[PDB]
Amino acid sequence: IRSYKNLNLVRANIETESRQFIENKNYSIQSIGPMPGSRAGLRVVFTRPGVNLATVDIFYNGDGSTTIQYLTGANRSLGQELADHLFETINPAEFEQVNMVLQGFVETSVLPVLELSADESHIEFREHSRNAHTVVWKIISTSYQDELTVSLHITTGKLQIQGRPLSCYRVFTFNLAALLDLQGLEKVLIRQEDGKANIVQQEVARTYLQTVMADAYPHLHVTAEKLLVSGLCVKLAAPDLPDYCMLLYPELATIEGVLKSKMSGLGMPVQQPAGFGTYFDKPAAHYILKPQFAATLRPEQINIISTAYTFFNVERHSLFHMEDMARLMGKATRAWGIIKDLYI
Amino acid sequence: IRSYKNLNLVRANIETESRQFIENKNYSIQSIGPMPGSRAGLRVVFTRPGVNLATVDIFYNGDGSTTIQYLTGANRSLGQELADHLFETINPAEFEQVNMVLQGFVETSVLPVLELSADESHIEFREHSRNAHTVVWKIISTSYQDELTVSLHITTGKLQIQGRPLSCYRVFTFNLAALLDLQGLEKVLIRQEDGKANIVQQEVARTYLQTVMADAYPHLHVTAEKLLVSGLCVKLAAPDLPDYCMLLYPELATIEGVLKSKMSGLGMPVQQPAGFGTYFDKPAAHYILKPQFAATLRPEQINIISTAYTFFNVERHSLFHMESDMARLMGKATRAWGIIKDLYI
């Protein structure tokens, strides 16, 4: 049916997006102006040779949202075109809100996660409120207009996450995945409460994972294998969803927890402020090693590590900014191939 | 913390099984004889130098069971030894009863399965009762003393299985598995009602099977892949059990539905009465082809088909006669996957 009320629309674009739409359809502007009367908003009257006058109202509601009113005037079928265009200027995920509770966190365990998330560019976090019972932080996307509210009840150790599954949610849970248990990781990856990844036979999934990495399996770091097995359980137990692009977190994060492990193992430690950019270059669409440090290594390891970091950064970026199931599983198989190749 | 009442003990062995215990312990027999009165059974009084007289009574109940009474006489610490020996001569599975209902069956869909089941040695099936609503058959293991009650309500098409998960149950469900959908197969493999195989991502299990079967995946018998993926979902969704040796049925049946397909596909059709024995000999627990038919094929096929039939029959035989719990099953399944892959050129 699709509803047009209470939309999180970019306010400053509302007018321009319309003129660039009507000229896009070779219509004619009658009048574009602020709504008459004590209501705030925008009345757009426009039409085209052959039909009637389309009138569209746009109320700016009190909470920052934007309600479209296309059922008015003399031509509604023509206002619904503008309504559908503007409605489709919004990322679909914005129609979902998340409000979930993870268990077992303190200030000294959460503060580094917000710190690491804010080490990203389009991410800032500030302390919002605090009392004896609760400390609440706000994460803001400078690029978009998305905010994410993290409320830590210290008196019980409960971390409450509220907001929208946009860039902020994805960056924060990516930095969070290294700490979560099985049920917490499930809860953040599928955004549903009663997942069933716990009832997965860890032995059969372990046989799977051992099957994928042939000779590299007995040399696997346990901090990588536990997370990959958990993530595989998550992949297996997920119910129907529209977008599974988020279920790659187990592998991606693991790659980090392994790349950091081999990078520093060959004279390239990832310092906390330095990060990864201080070690790699981007030629085209395939990041390579800085030649100063690539010269000391065999070309095999060079190509392996280059493909690894390129994959990591490309997929992380395309998951942070929102570029169904077979595609995800193939990407996961590629990630597993990379992880196996890292081990000689 | 076990109880000794209502045991399905092999009656004619009850006494013999006992003496080879008492002589085994260099104990001494006081008296072994039938109990007084209208009860049938056996009273065993024995002891050894150093202790008191142990008395063990054994009543033969009316339903075929056997109640042991070791809390009698002057010595219980010694009577419980004999009682525990007799109690441990029984396969543990006899202590479970199954009573389940499968959906979607008619008379003509069950009869060929009972015929295929009765093609076995220690398995018989007979029509027990019949009315307008329900026809009930009894499967009997002549070897053991296990019976299985199969009750088909035609008015709704519901097949009820009652009894014990012993040899009869295992043979019947193996000949039945090729027909079942996913949830019926789960119901027979875990013997529980609220299994969770339906909520398994069939796509991830499909990726798993595609990983294991390299080139044989685009060459797969489709009726084999449906059953294999179903069984993989069941394997992944199964709750904790004592014996997982039974969750291997998906691969085994597949091999049959493939061997029969390639056997006949290479000039060796498996007739219904003839079976598979018409093509192989058994030297040393590793079935080989009769040279008569191995000579007509390239040396490649000989070892593959021989190892395939050898593995199938070994595992089926050890499952019909009850020889980590889950790692064991997964390793057996990995070998089965290697075999199924090698069967496809």
DSSP per position, B262-281? HHGGGT----TTT-STTTEE
Question: Using CA atoms, how far apart are residues A230 and A72, in angstroms rounded to an integer?
Answer: 54
CB contact under 8 A, A237 and B208: no
Q: Please answer whether residues A142 and A157 qualify as being in contact, where contact means their C-beta atoms are separated by less than 8 angstroms.
A: no
Q: Do the Cβ atoms of A342 and A304 come closer than 8 Å?
A: yes
Describe the crossing of helices A107-118 and A167-176 by its angle, rounded to 10 degrees. Answer: 130
To one decimal, the resolution in angstroms is 3.9
Q: Which of A196, A204, A329 sits opposite B199 (nearest CB)?
A: A196
Signed CA dihedral, B228, B234, B240, B241: sign only: negative
Task: Tell me the residue length of chain B.
Answer: 345
**Three-state SS for B211?**
helix
Contact A333 B207 (CB under 8 A): yes
Task: Tell me the chain A residues in contact with residue B237 when contact means C-beta distances shorter than 8 Å.
Answer: 199-201
Count of CB atoms within 10 A of residue B72's CB? 14
Q: A213 to chain B: which residues are within 8 Å by CB?
A: none
Closest Cα to residue A258, out of A178, A149, A176?
Answer: A178
Contact: B212, A212; criterion CB under 8 Å: no
From the list A199, A208, A325, the residue facing B196 with the nearest CB is: A199
User: Is the CB of A238 less than 8 angstroms away from the CB of B327?
Assistant: no
Q: Is A63 helix (H, G, I), strand (E, B) or coil?
A: coil
Which of B160, B40, B41, B144 minimizes the C-alpha distance to B94?
Answer: B144
Residues A220-235 as b/e (b if ≥16 CB within 10 A, e otherwise) read: beeebbebbbbbbbbb
B193/A137 Cα distance (integer angstroms): 47
Provide the CA A228 distance to its chain's centre, in angstroms. Answer: 20
Distance of CA A120 to the CA centre of its chain: 13
Chain B, nearest residue to A234 by Cα: B201
Give the residue numbers in B contacting A (CB under 8 Å), as ranges: 196, 199-201, 203-205, 207-208, 211-212, 232, 235-239, 324, 326-327, 330, 333-334
User: How many angstroms separate the CA atoms of A150 and A136, rounded?
Assistant: 6
Task: Please name the residue of chain A whose CA is at the shortest distance from the CA of residue B204.
Answer: A236
Residue B258 burial (CB count, 10 A):
20
Contacts for A15 with CB less than 8 Å, ≥ 6 apart: A32, A42
Q: Which of B203, B240, B329 to mutate to test the interface with A (most CBs of A within 10 A)?
A: B203
Residue of A nearest to B195 (CA): A199
Chain A environment of B232 (Cβ under 8 Å)? 204
> How is the beta sheet containing B28-34 ordered, strand by strand?
B28-34, B41-47, B54-60, B66-69
Q: How far is B201 from chain A (nearest CA, A)?
A: 5
Of B200, B203, B237, the CB nearest to A329: B203
C-beta of residue B63 within 8 angstroms of C-beta of residue B138: no
Q: Is A151 within 8 Å of A162 (Cβ atoms)?
A: yes
- Helices of type H across B162-277: 167-176, 182-190, 202-212, 222-237, 249-263
Other residues' Cβ atoms within 10 Å of the Cβ of residue A108: 7
What phi and psi, each to the nearest 5 degrees, are found at residue B68? Answer: -95, 140
Asked if A293 and A287 touch (Cβ cutoff 8 Å), the reply is: no
Q: Which of A189, A192, A204 to probe the B interface (max B CBs under 10 A)? A: A204
Q: Are B268 and B293 in contact (CB under 8 A)?
A: yes
Find, among B248, B234, B227, the residue nearest to B200 by Cα: B234
Q: How far apart are CA B309 and CA B45, in angstroms?
A: 51
Q: Which residues contact A41 (CB under 8 A, 6 or more apart)?
A: A34, A35, A57, A58, A59, A60
Chain A interface disruption, residue of B186, B194, B199, B204, most A CBs within 10 A: B204
Residues of A in contact with B198 (CB under 8 A): none
CB-based burial label for B180 (10 Å; 0-12, 13-18, 19+) = buried
Pick from A208, A212, A237: CB nearest B201: A237
Q: Output b/e per residue, A187-215; b: 16+ Cβ within 10 A.
A: bbbbbeeebbbeebbbbbbbbbbbebbee
Largest pairwise CA distance in chain B:
73
- A318 membership: H or E segment, kind and range: helix A299-320
C-alpha dihedral sign at B211, B214, B218, B221? negative
CB contact under 8 A, B211 and A207: no
The 10 Å Cβ neighbour count of residue B38 is 5
d(Cα B232, Cα B329) in Å, to the nearest integer?
A: 12
A227 contact partners, CB below 8 Å, separation of at least 6: A177, A178, A250, A253, A254, A257
**Chain A: residue whose CA lies nearest to B327:** A203
| Helices marked H in chain B | 11-22, 76-88, 107-118, 167-176, 182-190, 202-212, 222-237, 249-263, 291-294, 299-320, 325-343
For strands A147-153 and A158-163, give the pairing.
antiparallel
Contact flag A201-B324 (C-beta cutoff 8 Å): no
Most A CBs within 10 Å, among B207, B228, B248, B337, to test the A interface: B207
Q: Give the distance from residue A188's alpha carbon to the nearest chain B alpha carbon, in angstroms.
A: 18
- Classify each residue of A78-104 as buried b or exposed e, where b means 16 or more C-beta atoms within 10 Å of its C-beta: bbbbbbebbbeeebebbeeeeeeebee
CB atoms within 10 A of CB A140: 17
Cβ <8 Å between A326 and B201: no
Cα angle B243, B247, B250; round to 5 = 165
DSSP category for residue A143: S
Question: Which residues from B are below 8 Å from A234, CB to CB?
Answer: none
If phi over 0 gives left and psi between -120 and 50 gives alpha, with beta otherwise, what is residue A278?
alpha
Q: Could you tell me if A234 and A197 are in contact, meaning their C-beta atoms sit under 8 angstroms apart?
A: yes
Distance between CA A31 and CA A19 in Å, rounded? 11
Q: Which residues of A touch B207 (CB under 8 A)?
A: 329, 333
CA-closest candidate to residue A83, choices A46, A126, A137: A46
Q: Which residue of B has its CA nearest to A326?
A: B203
Cβ atoms within 10 Å of A7's Cβ, excluding its own:
19
Q: Tell me the nearest-neighbour CA distance from B341 into chain A, angstroms.
A: 15
Experimental determination technique: X-ray
Cα separation, A49 vs A28, in Å, equals: 8
- Please state whether beta strands B280-281 and B288-289 pair in parallel, antiparallel, or not at all (unpaired): antiparallel
Q: Looking at beta carbons, which residues of chain B come within 8 Å of A237?
A: 199-201
User: Going along B131-175, which residue ranges are E strands?
Assistant: 134-140, 147-153, 158-163
Rounded CA gap, B269 and A294, in Å?
A: 63
- Which chain B residues have a beta carbon less than 8 Å from that of A250? none
Q: Which residues does A323 contact at the CB level (< 8 Å), separation at least 6?
A: none
β-pairing, B66-69 vs A123-130, is unpaired
Instruction: Tell me the C-alpha distance between A276 and A279, whole Å.
Output: 6
Of B53, B45, B36, B171, residue with least CA distance to B114: B171
